[PDB]
Design an enzyme around this catalytic site. Structure first.
Site, PDB file in Angstrom:
ATOM      1  N   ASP A  25       0.820  -1.317   0.024  1.00 62.12           N
ATOM      2  CA  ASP A  25       0.091   0.002  -0.094  1.00 62.12           C
ATOM      3  C   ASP A  25       0.826   1.245  -0.022  1.00 62.12           C
ATOM      4  O   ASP A  25       1.242   1.701   1.064  1.00 62.12           O
ATOM      5  CB  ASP A  25      -0.894  -0.212   1.100  1.00 62.12           C
ATOM      6  N   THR A  26       0.909   1.679  -1.185  1.00 62.64           N
ATOM      7  CA  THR A  26       1.589   3.136  -1.304  1.00 62.64           C
ATOM      8  C   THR A  26       1.088   4.134  -0.437  1.00 62.64           C
ATOM      9  O   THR A  26       1.549   5.374  -0.277  1.00 62.64           O
ATOM     10  CB  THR A  26       1.807   3.421  -2.911  1.00 62.64           C
ATOM     11  N   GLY A  27      -0.350   4.011  -0.305  1.00 60.99           N
ATOM     12  CA  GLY A  27      -1.151   5.132   0.302  1.00 60.99           C
ATOM     13  C   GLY A  27      -0.752   5.059   1.810  1.00 60.99           C
ATOM     14  O   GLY A  27      -1.342   6.288   2.675  1.00 60.99           O
TER      15      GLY A  27
HETATM   16  C1  LIG Z   1     -13.174  -5.885   5.448  1.00 56.96           C
HETATM   17  C2  LIG Z   1     -13.008  -4.795   4.454  1.00 56.96           C
HETATM   18  O1  LIG Z   1     -13.093  -3.507   5.278  1.00 56.96           O
HETATM   19  P1  LIG Z   1     -13.460  -2.066   4.507  1.00 56.96           P
HETATM   20  O2  LIG Z   1     -14.104  -2.264   3.230  1.00 56.96           O
HETATM   21  C3  LIG Z   1     -12.078  -0.897   4.573  1.00 56.96           C
HETATM   22  O3  LIG Z   1     -11.019  -1.781   3.936  1.00 56.96           O
HETATM   23  C4  LIG Z   1      -9.943  -1.181   3.778  1.00 56.96           C
HETATM   24  C5  LIG Z   1      -9.449   0.013   4.682  1.00 56.96           C
HETATM   25  C6  LIG Z   1      -8.088   0.695   4.262  1.00 56.96           C
HETATM   26  C7  LIG Z   1      -7.380   0.406   2.944  1.00 56.96           C
HETATM   27  C8  LIG Z   1      -6.007   1.120   2.890  1.00 56.96           C
HETATM   28  C9  LIG Z   1      -6.498   2.318   2.496  1.00 56.96           C
HETATM   29  N1  LIG Z   1      -7.526   2.655   1.329  1.00 56.96           N
HETATM   30  C10 LIG Z   1      -8.785   3.038   1.445  1.00 56.96           C
HETATM   31  O4  LIG Z   1      -9.106   3.774   2.482  1.00 56.96           O
HETATM   32  O5  LIG Z   1      -9.585   2.989   0.083  1.00 56.96           O
HETATM   33  C11 LIG Z   1     -10.991   3.088   0.291  1.00 56.96           C
HETATM   34  C12 LIG Z   1     -11.022   3.969  -1.028  1.00 56.96           C
HETATM   35  O6  LIG Z   1     -11.068   2.752  -2.050  1.00 56.96           O
HETATM   36  C13 LIG Z   1     -11.760   1.720  -1.340  1.00 56.96           C
HETATM   37  O7  LIG Z   1     -11.050   0.412  -1.491  1.00 56.96           O
HETATM   38  C14 LIG Z   1     -10.281   0.229  -0.021  1.00 56.96           C
HETATM   39  C15 LIG Z   1     -11.231   0.949   0.997  1.00 56.96           C
HETATM   40  C16 LIG Z   1     -11.568   2.270   0.248  1.00 56.96           C
HETATM   41  C17 LIG Z   1      -5.416   3.496   2.047  1.00 56.96           C
HETATM   42  O8  LIG Z   1      -4.562   2.760   1.094  1.00 56.96           O
HETATM   43  C18 LIG Z   1      -4.339   3.609   3.178  1.00 56.96           C
HETATM   44  N2  LIG Z   1      -5.013   4.624   3.982  1.00 56.96           N
HETATM   45  C19 LIG Z   1      -4.579   6.027   4.094  1.00 56.96           C
HETATM   46  C20 LIG Z   1      -5.294   6.982   2.878  1.00 56.96           C
HETATM   47  C21 LIG Z   1      -6.744   6.705   3.040  1.00 56.96           C
HETATM   48  C22 LIG Z   1      -4.658   8.191   2.892  1.00 56.96           C
HETATM   49  C23 LIG Z   1      -4.513   8.938   4.429  1.00 56.96           C
HETATM   50  S1  LIG Z   1      -5.343   3.877   5.670  1.00 56.96           S
HETATM   51  O9  LIG Z   1      -5.604   2.663   5.543  1.00 56.96           O
HETATM   52  O10 LIG Z   1      -6.440   4.892   6.295  1.00 56.96           O
HETATM   53  C24 LIG Z   1      -3.959   4.343   6.643  1.00 56.96           C
HETATM   54  C25 LIG Z   1      -4.062   5.352   7.508  1.00 56.96           C
HETATM   55  C26 LIG Z   1      -2.838   5.593   8.532  1.00 56.96           C
HETATM   56  C27 LIG Z   1      -1.612   4.753   8.397  1.00 56.96           C
HETATM   57  C28 LIG Z   1      -0.329   4.845   9.160  1.00 56.96           C
HETATM   58  C29 LIG Z   1      -0.445   5.867  10.331  1.00 56.96           C
HETATM   59  O11 LIG Z   1       0.367   5.471   8.264  1.00 56.96           O
HETATM   60  C30 LIG Z   1      -1.752   3.431   7.515  1.00 56.96           C
HETATM   61  C31 LIG Z   1      -2.617   3.362   6.691  1.00 56.96           C
HETATM   62  C32 LIG Z   1      -7.754  -0.600   2.230  1.00 56.96           C
HETATM   63  C33 LIG Z   1      -9.231  -1.435   2.686  1.00 56.96           C
HETATM   64  O12 LIG Z   1     -14.599  -1.265   5.482  1.00 56.96           O
HETATM   65  C34 LIG Z   1     -14.262  -0.880   6.722  1.00 56.96           C
HETATM   66  C35 LIG Z   1     -15.605  -0.347   7.476  1.00 56.96           C
END
Ligand SMILES: CCOP(=O)(COc1ccc(C[C@H](NC(=O)O[C@H]2CO[C@H]3OCC[C@H]32)[C@H](O)CN(C[C@@H](C)CC)S(=O)(=O)c2ccc([C@H](C)O)cc2)cc1)OCC
Lengths: 99, 99
Positions: A25-27
């Site tokens: 995860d590059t994000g």
């Molecule tokens: C069982 C399934 O659970 P679920 O569906 C959630 O699943 C997911 C949850 C998170 C992710 C990874 C997350 N991607 C994400 O938000 O993508 C959204 C948009 O596209 C959709 O696709 C995937 C979800 C939707 C992103 O890459 C990384 N993020 C930061 C980013 C947002 C920029 C600030 S982070 O993770 O917040 C994060 C914060 C702080 C740190 C430390 C401090 O550095 C590390 C990580 C992938 C799937 O429901 C839950 C109620």
């Protein structure tokens, strides 16, 4: 290797003597993994993304193997819905984005 | 380009005729931008992140240029912590992970 992004970039990792599946995860600045009862000291932290913040435990200098590539660094453990390998470790395995 | 991960992979995008900065995010399935004005119809949608679910405006078939590379696809607009380019558009611009 080269990983296309048609599907989620999930790989097997080894951490704390356990195999898990995690996204490259590059994000993510840092690495966040599902609850696991790792030995050693830790520091509480709160990390946020879409939907808000969760509480995690910060462990330092943890050994992780990612697709056979060894890395050592901080791992945040808690009730995350997904395991993410973040940039703190992706740099250590020489991972780049290319287009 | 080849983009290393010692810093956040932030790039300039062009959407709705305006320039903005966004993060290339392989852990995102979808592209989510912070609140902005975009022309045309949209539909209410829910999307889930690390912290739970949020409401977004879904804009379909939107022209967007990412680091010099054109895409046309779905853009979600709502209270994301930062503008993220997800895999729906990363695939369009030919982005892979490499290590
Ligand atoms: C069982 C399934 O659970 P679920 O569906 C959630 O699943 C997911 C949850 C998170 C992710 C990874 C997350 N991607 C994400 O938000 O993508 C959204 C948009 O596209 C959709 O696709 C995937 C979800 C939707 C992103 O890459 C990384 N993020 C930061 C980013 C947002 C920029 C600030 S982070 O993770 O917040 C994060 C914060 C702080 C740190 C430390 C401090 O550095 C590390 C990580 C992938 C799937 O429901 C839950 C109620």
């Amino acid at each position: 290797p080269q990983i296309t992004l048609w599907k989620r970039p999930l790989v097997t990792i080894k951490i704390g003597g356990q195999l898990k599946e995690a996204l490259l995860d590059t994000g993510a600045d840092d690495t966040v993994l599902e609850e696991m009862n790792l030995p050693g000291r830790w520091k509480p932290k709160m990390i946020g993304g879409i939907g808000g913040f969760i509480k995690v435990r910060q462990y330092d200098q943890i050994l992780i193997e990612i697709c056979g590539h060894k890395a050592i660094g901080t791992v945040l453990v808690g009730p995350t819905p997904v395991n993410v390998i973040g940039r703190n470790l992706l740099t250590q395995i020489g991972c780049t984005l290319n287009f």
